[PDB]
Coordinates of C-alpha atoms (C1' of nucleotides) in Angstrom, one line a residue:
Chain A
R2 CA 68.9 88.9 95.1
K3 CA 68.5 92.8 95.2
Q4 CA 70.7 95.0 93.3
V5 CA 71.5 98.3 95.9
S6 CA 74.1 100.2 93.7
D7 CA 76.9 101.0 96.7
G8 CA 79.6 99.4 98.6
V9 CA 82.2 100.1 100.3
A10 CA 86.2 98.5 99.8
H11 CA 88.4 98.0 102.9
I12 CA 92.2 97.6 101.6
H13 CA 95.3 97.0 104.1
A14 CA 98.7 96.6 102.3
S15 CA 101.9 95.8 103.9
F16 CA 106.1 94.3 103.7
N17 CA 105.0 90.7 104.2
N18 CA 100.9 90.2 102.3
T19 CA 97.1 92.5 101.3
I20 CA 93.5 92.4 102.8
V21 CA 91.1 93.8 100.0
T22 CA 88.0 93.1 102.0
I23 CA 84.0 94.0 100.3
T24 CA 81.3 95.6 102.7
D25 CA 78.3 98.0 102.6
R26 CA 78.5 100.6 104.5
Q27 CA 76.2 99.1 107.1
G28 CA 79.6 97.4 108.6
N29 CA 78.9 93.4 106.9
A30 CA 81.4 91.7 104.2
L31 CA 80.4 90.8 101.1
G32 CA 84.2 88.7 99.8
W33 CA 87.5 89.6 100.9
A34 CA 90.8 88.3 99.0
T35 CA 94.6 88.7 99.8
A36 CA 97.9 88.3 98.7
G37 CA 99.1 85.4 100.4
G38 CA 96.2 83.9 99.3
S39 CA 96.6 84.5 95.7
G40 CA 99.1 81.1 95.5
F41 CA 103.0 83.8 96.7
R42 CA 105.1 83.3 99.5
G43 CA 108.4 85.3 101.1
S44 CA 109.1 89.3 99.5
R45 CA 107.3 87.9 96.5
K46 CA 103.9 87.8 98.8
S47 CA 103.8 92.2 99.5
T48 CA 104.7 92.8 95.3
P49 CA 101.6 94.9 94.2
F50 CA 101.2 91.9 91.5
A51 CA 99.9 89.7 94.2
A52 CA 98.1 92.4 95.1
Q53 CA 96.6 93.1 91.7
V54 CA 95.4 89.4 91.3
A55 CA 93.9 89.7 94.7
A56 CA 92.0 92.4 93.6
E57 CA 91.2 91.3 90.6
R58 CA 89.7 87.6 92.0
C59 CA 87.7 90.5 95.2
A60 CA 86.5 91.6 91.5
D61 CA 84.7 89.5 91.6
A62 CA 82.7 89.8 94.1
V63 CA 78.7 91.4 95.0
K64 CA 77.2 91.4 91.4
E65 CA 74.0 89.8 92.5
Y66 CA 74.1 92.9 95.1
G67 CA 74.3 94.5 91.1
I68 CA 77.2 97.4 93.3
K69 CA 79.3 99.7 91.7
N70 CA 79.5 103.1 93.4
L71 CA 82.8 102.6 95.8
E72 CA 84.2 104.5 98.5
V73 CA 88.2 102.9 99.4
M74 CA 89.3 103.2 102.9
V75 CA 92.9 102.3 103.3
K76 CA 94.8 100.4 105.4
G77 CA 99.2 99.6 105.8
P78 CA 102.6 101.0 103.4
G79 CA 103.1 98.4 101.4
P80 CA 102.6 98.9 98.0
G81 CA 99.9 97.6 97.8
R82 CA 97.9 99.5 98.4
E83 CA 97.5 101.0 95.4
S84 CA 97.5 98.4 91.8
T85 CA 94.6 97.6 94.3
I86 CA 92.4 100.3 93.3
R87 CA 92.8 100.9 90.2
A88 CA 92.1 97.1 88.7
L89 CA 88.9 97.2 91.5
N90 CA 88.4 100.4 89.6
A91 CA 88.8 99.6 86.5
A92 CA 86.8 96.3 86.5
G93 CA 83.0 97.8 86.0
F94 CA 83.0 99.8 89.8
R95 CA 83.8 103.9 89.9
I96 CA 85.9 105.3 93.5
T97 CA 84.3 108.3 94.3
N98 CA 86.0 108.6 98.2
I99 CA 90.1 107.8 99.1
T100 CA 90.7 107.7 102.3
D101 CA 93.2 107.1 104.8
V102 CA 92.8 105.0 107.9
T103 CA 95.8 103.5 108.9
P104 CA 95.6 103.8 113.3
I105 CA 99.2 105.0 114.9
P106 CA 99.6 105.6 118.3
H107 CA 100.3 109.4 119.1
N108 CA 102.5 108.4 120.9
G109 CA 103.0 105.6 123.2
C110 CA 104.2 103.6 124.7
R111 CA 108.1 102.8 123.2
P112 CA 109.5 102.8 119.8
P113 CA 109.1 100.2 118.2
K114 CA 112.9 97.6 117.3
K115 CA 112.4 94.6 115.6
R116 CA 114.7 92.1 113.7
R117 CA 118.5 93.3 113.8
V118 CA 120.4 90.6 111.2
Chain B
rA1 C1' 138.7 153.2 168.2
rA2 C1' 135.5 155.1 164.8
rG3 C1' 133.7 156.9 160.1
rC4 C1' 132.7 156.2 154.4
rU5 C1' 131.2 152.9 150.3
rU6 C1' 131.5 150.7 145.4
rG7 C1' 131.2 144.8 147.2
rA8 C1' 126.5 142.1 148.3
rG9 C1' 120.8 141.7 150.0
rU10 C1' 116.1 142.9 150.5
rC11 C1' 111.9 146.3 149.7
rU12 C1' 108.0 149.7 146.3
rC13 C1' 105.9 148.8 141.4
rG14 C1' 106.9 145.2 137.8
rU15 C1' 108.5 140.1 134.2
rA16 C1' 109.3 134.7 132.5
rG17 C1' 109.0 129.0 132.7
rA18 C1' 107.9 121.4 130.4
rG19 C1' 111.4 122.9 138.1
rG20 C1' 109.6 120.3 142.4
rG21 C1' 105.6 117.9 145.3
rG22 C1' 99.7 116.0 147.1
rG23 C1' 94.6 115.6 145.0
rG24 C1' 91.8 114.4 141.6
rU25 C1' 90.1 112.9 135.8
rA26 C1' 91.0 112.1 130.1
rG27 C1' 92.5 112.4 124.6
rA28 C1' 93.3 107.3 122.1
rA29 C1' 96.0 102.5 120.8
rU30 C1' 97.8 97.3 121.5
rU31 C1' 94.9 93.6 123.5
rC32 C1' 90.9 90.5 125.1
rC33 C1' 85.7 89.8 125.9
rA34 C1' 80.7 89.8 123.6
rG35 C1' 77.2 90.6 119.0
rG36 C1' 75.3 91.3 113.5
rU37 C1' 77.6 89.9 107.5
rG38 C1' 81.3 87.0 106.1
rU39 C1' 84.9 83.7 104.0
rA40 C1' 90.0 79.8 104.5
rG41 C1' 93.1 81.0 104.8
rC42 C1' 96.6 84.6 109.1
rG43 C1' 101.7 85.7 110.6
rG44 C1' 107.4 85.0 109.1
rU45 C1' 110.8 85.7 106.1
rG46 C1' 116.8 84.5 102.3
rA47 C1' 112.8 80.5 103.6
rA48 C1' 110.1 78.8 107.6
rA49 C1' 107.8 75.9 111.6
rU50 C1' 106.5 76.3 116.2
rG51 C1' 101.7 79.6 116.6
rC52 C1' 97.2 81.6 115.3
rG53 C1' 93.2 79.1 112.4
rU54 C1' 85.7 76.1 110.1
rA55 C1' 86.7 75.2 118.3
rG56 C1' 84.4 80.0 112.1
rA57 C1' 90.0 82.3 112.2
rG58 C1' 92.2 87.2 109.2
rA59 C1' 89.1 90.9 107.5
rU60 C1' 84.8 94.3 108.5
rC61 C1' 81.1 97.3 111.8
rU62 C1' 79.7 97.5 116.7
rG63 C1' 79.1 97.3 122.4
rG64 C1' 83.7 97.0 126.7
rA65 C1' 87.2 97.6 130.2
rG66 C1' 92.3 97.1 132.6
rG67 C1' 96.4 98.9 132.4
rA68 C1' 101.0 101.2 130.6
rA69 C1' 102.2 105.8 127.4
rU70 C1' 100.6 111.1 126.5
rA71 C1' 100.4 113.9 118.2
rC72 C1' 99.3 118.5 116.3
rC73 C1' 100.8 123.6 119.6
rG74 C1' 107.0 121.9 119.5
rG75 C1' 111.2 126.2 117.9
rU76 C1' 118.2 130.0 117.4
rG77 C1' 112.0 127.8 122.5
rG78 C1' 112.1 127.4 128.5
rC79 C1' 112.8 125.5 133.8
rG80 C1' 116.1 122.6 137.4
rA81 C1' 122.3 123.0 140.7

RNA sequence: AAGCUUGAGUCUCGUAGAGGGGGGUAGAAUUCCAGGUGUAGCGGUGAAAUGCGUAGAGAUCUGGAGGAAUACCGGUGGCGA
């Protein structure tokens, strides 16, 4: 109801999907979008554009909270970790900080091995 | 039968290391329990379904624990048969 100018975004991009959540630095979420929830499937569900449209759908949030100043905390290897920021920083918001927060085992317990075809 | 020493070794004073054994306890990440903010998806893939989803998931912030495995330093750098 009142304009507070400030927020923080949490972005995760994988080889199958991309997630974009808008929060306040008090940890409190205000809205979220995904590349799967954008209506995308298969090898296309992770794409830079399926994530770009998810960022445009998320950039409609927080209008009544009047947020413009933005920090971004990024995760995952997926191509969606770039187009999402570019589009959100064009949709009225201004970036001040981008930091990678990918949680990593350093190092244990046995190396991953999956899907051989 | 008896000398000699080069063979082998030890001692004085020093050199180096993820060698082994006994007993402590600490740096994080899967994951799950519990609450705030929050909403309809998440997971897989050439596609998917079982499965997890309003019984409020995933995302975020926080509180917490068992147990396995221990980044950087770390290298033409080392130890053990």
